[PDB]
Design a protein around this ligand. Structure first.
Ligand SMILES: COc1ccc(C(=O)O)cc1
Length: 121
């Protein structure tokens, strides 16, 4: 679910999903179009594609379970949709951590009109 993803993001990065990643660039918190602005935005682009791989799943509301082994995220077994959702979120959270070094506040509340064009998954 979105709230669980938000908790995962905070755990991983120390940033609040809202407002750090809810309106960032072209794809974070509300993707759609344009060339991703930076590596963080690309995390959200891939995350969006990842959810797009699951048309018959409901990633916003469906809850999954995960644990930490060391600091590593381990998705626990639930339904097929839950497992696949968890893997998408895990990847994104790790991606955000990997790219904290280039996270830029200037991409927060990024205006829609600067995001144009379709980019294929
Ligand atoms: C509503 O909260 C969020 C938080 C993060 C993201 C994201 O990282 O894409 C989307 C919505």
């Amino acid at each position: 679910s979105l709230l669980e993803f938000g908790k995962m993001i905070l755990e991983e990065t120390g940033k609040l999903a809202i407002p750090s990643y809810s309106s960032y660039g072209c794809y974070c918190g509300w993707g759609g179009k344009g060339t991703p602005k930076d590596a963080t935005d690309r995390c959200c682009f891939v995350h969006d594609c990842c959810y797009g791989n699951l048309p018959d799943c409901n990633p916003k509301s469906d809850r999954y379970k995960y644990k930490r082994v060391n600091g590593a995220i381990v998705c626990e077994k639930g339904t097929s949709c839950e497992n696949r959702i968890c893997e998408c979120d895990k990847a994104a959270a790790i991606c955000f951590r990997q790219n904290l070094n280039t996270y830029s506040k200037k991409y927060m509340l990024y205006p829609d009109f600067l995001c144009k064009g379709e980019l294929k998954c």
